[PDB]
Design an enzyme around this catalytic site. Sequence first.
Site, PDB file in Angstrom:
ATOM      1  N   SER A  61     -12.550  16.701  52.010  1.00 39.20           N
ATOM      2  CA  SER A  61     -13.415  17.270  50.988  1.00 39.20           C
ATOM      3  C   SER A  61     -14.867  17.459  51.419  1.00 39.20           C
ATOM      4  CB  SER A  61     -13.413  16.377  49.753  1.00 39.20           C
ATOM      5  OG  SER A  61     -12.347  16.721  48.891  1.00 39.20           O
ATOM      6  N   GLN A 117      -4.909  19.624  42.629  1.00 41.86           N
ATOM      7  CA  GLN A 117      -4.233  20.245  43.754  1.00 41.86           C
ATOM      8  C   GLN A 117      -3.590  21.567  43.344  1.00 41.86           C
ATOM      9  OE1 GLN A 117      -2.638  16.887  42.873  1.00 41.86           O
ATOM     10  NE2 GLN A 117      -2.674  15.723  44.795  1.00 41.86           N
ATOM     11  N   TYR A 147     -12.698  16.946  38.979  1.00 43.81           N
ATOM     12  CA  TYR A 147     -12.668  17.311  40.393  1.00 43.81           C
ATOM     13  C   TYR A 147     -11.372  18.038  40.722  1.00 43.81           C
ATOM     14  CZ  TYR A 147     -13.541  16.441  45.398  1.00 43.81           C
ATOM     15  OH  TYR A 147     -13.794  16.569  46.750  1.00 43.81           O
ATOM     16  N   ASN A 149      -9.512  20.831  43.740  1.00 43.37           N
ATOM     17  CA  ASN A 149      -9.418  21.778  44.840  1.00 43.37           C
ATOM     18  C   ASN A 149      -9.144  23.189  44.341  1.00 43.37           C
ATOM     19  OD1 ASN A 149      -9.745  19.775  46.737  1.00 43.37           O
ATOM     20  ND2 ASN A 149      -7.543  19.570  47.138  1.00 43.37           N
ATOM     21  N   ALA A 311     -11.456  13.054  52.437  1.00 44.30           N
ATOM     22  CA  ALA A 311     -10.292  12.421  53.033  1.00 44.30           C
ATOM     23  C   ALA A 311      -9.207  13.450  53.296  1.00 44.30           C
ATOM     24  CB  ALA A 311      -9.742  11.319  52.120  1.00 44.30           C
ATOM     25  N   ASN A 336      -7.718   7.040  56.365  1.00 40.93           N
ATOM     26  CA  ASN A 336      -8.251   7.219  55.011  1.00 40.93           C
ATOM     27  C   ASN A 336      -8.386   5.847  54.355  1.00 40.93           C
ATOM     28  OD1 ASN A 336      -8.982   8.019  52.435  1.00 40.93           O
ATOM     29  ND2 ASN A 336      -6.944   8.797  51.906  1.00 40.93           N
TER      30      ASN A 336
HETATM   31  O1  LIG Z   1      -7.748  17.208  48.509  1.00 45.49           O
HETATM   32  S1  LIG Z   1      -8.818  16.551  49.258  1.00 45.49           S
HETATM   33  O2  LIG Z   1      -9.871  17.535  49.420  1.00 45.49           O
HETATM   34  N1  LIG Z   1      -8.219  16.070  50.770  1.00 45.49           N
HETATM   35  C1  LIG Z   1      -6.793  16.060  51.021  1.00 45.49           C
HETATM   36  C2  LIG Z   1      -6.107  17.227  51.326  1.00 45.49           C
HETATM   37  C3  LIG Z   1      -4.738  17.179  51.581  1.00 45.49           C
HETATM   38  C4  LIG Z   1      -4.076  15.957  51.530  1.00 45.49           C
HETATM   39  F1  LIG Z   1      -2.742  15.873  51.773  1.00 45.49           F
HETATM   40  C5  LIG Z   1      -4.786  14.765  51.221  1.00 45.49           C
HETATM   41  C6  LIG Z   1      -4.113  13.496  51.174  1.00 45.49           C
HETATM   42  N2  LIG Z   1      -4.804  12.377  50.877  1.00 45.49           N
HETATM   43  C7  LIG Z   1      -6.130  12.436  50.631  1.00 45.49           C
HETATM   44  C8  LIG Z   1      -6.803  13.640  50.672  1.00 45.49           C
HETATM   45  C9  LIG Z   1      -6.112  14.814  50.975  1.00 45.49           C
HETATM   46  C10 LIG Z   1      -9.463  15.081  48.440  1.00 45.49           C
HETATM   47  C11 LIG Z   1      -8.934  14.675  47.229  1.00 45.49           C
HETATM   48  C12 LIG Z   1      -9.426  13.545  46.615  1.00 45.49           C
HETATM   49 CL1  LIG Z   1      -8.753  13.017  45.054  1.00 45.49          CL
HETATM   50  C13 LIG Z   1     -10.440  12.821  47.207  1.00 45.49           C
HETATM   51  C14 LIG Z   1     -10.965  13.229  48.422  1.00 45.49           C
HETATM   52 CL2  LIG Z   1     -12.261  12.246  49.132  1.00 45.49          CL
HETATM   53  C15 LIG Z   1     -10.476  14.372  49.055  1.00 45.49           C
HETATM   54  O3  LIG Z   1     -10.971  14.834  50.297  1.00 45.49           O
END
Ligand SMILES: O=S(=O)(Nc1ccc(F)c2cnccc12)c1cc(Cl)cc(Cl)c1O
Length: 354
Positions: A61, A117, A147, A149, A311, A336
């Site tokens: 992120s 997601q 929050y 994506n 992460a 992570n």
């Molecule tokens: O979506 S993320 O942007 N990153 C990820 C993408 C793809 C994955 F399979 C991830 C698996 N575990 C953790 C993060 C993954 C994200 C989400 C959150 Cl709730 C917090 C942070 Cl700090 C963050 O970066």
Amino acid sequence: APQQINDIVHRTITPLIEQQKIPGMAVAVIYQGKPYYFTWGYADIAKKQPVTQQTLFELGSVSKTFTGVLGGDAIARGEIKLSDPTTKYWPELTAKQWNGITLLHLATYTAGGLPLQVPDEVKSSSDLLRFYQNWQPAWAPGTQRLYANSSIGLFGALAVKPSGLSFEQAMQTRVFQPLKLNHTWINVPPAEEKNYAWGYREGKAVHVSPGALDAEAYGVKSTIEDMARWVQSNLKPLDINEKTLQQGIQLAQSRYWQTGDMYQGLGWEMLDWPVNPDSIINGIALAARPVKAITPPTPAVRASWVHKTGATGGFGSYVAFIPEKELGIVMLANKNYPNPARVDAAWQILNALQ
Ligand SMILES: O=S(=O)(Nc1ccc(F)c2cnccc12)c1cc(Cl)cc(Cl)c1O
């Protein structure tokens, strides 16, 4: 390196690595505008490859800060406006729930509950259109922060549409290249695979998997040197010669919404400095938080703790800086591990040095 920096970094990070079982880590401290680098452990356990200043880590992120700045640059170029309706750049988004949802809402997670997601089943442009058309907001736009994506990722995809460039090409030409981030990538080229660390999850070596809007939401990989440069550029945007990029960096650190002690920028998040560490950590739980609009947004405040955590399945990253004190930190790890530990360590280091 000055002994104060050496000492606070090693005395903070060594116990962190031990307690969290982190295989490899890189840290940069920016102190009065100069970077100092530190590395520990392994980028690849099986091949016994150490972490170096050229090792690439998945930023997760933290990528959103790049997306936010690229969006800011597009605003400064006159290509988009944050007040534009989402439908101006995606007219095929005809479902009535989209009326009143603007690019600002997407960029700041306030559209009304877009999900964290994008589903794995979404692949093609038509799958993505269908997903957004069928999404039902729980809340009116501009009332709560969740929050997501699927929010900022759509913002990034739409922000580059007027340019005609792909998201990756726009990011390379308009952000990475001007700032000399020459080892920062959305897709790691074969030539750089020797430097790409493996992430570790439950002891298994893993890399992030492809997904819809991955580039825009969590797809950047970078070295500790390039991330130090990114922090420097965000600390001192006035040193940047490309006018629209300087302006876009400023726009990304503007304060658009407040919840509790935190203010939401474009990608970046901010708190007033001096800041209590507990307050920083107060924002593991997916939280729906009512927000207050900052009308109009406050320009970047120099006495701020500006930060972002990131992460992936196998990686943990953190960036924080304080513009007023010319001070910043980047922590990149190939496991992570919990966010509070990251914030605690960063605050220990920066508070010691300010
Ligand atoms: O979506 S993320 O942007 N990153 C990820 C993408 C793809 C994955 F399979 C991830 C698996 N575990 C953790 C993060 C993954 C994200 C989400 C959150 Cl709730 C917090 C942070 Cl700090 C963050 O970066």
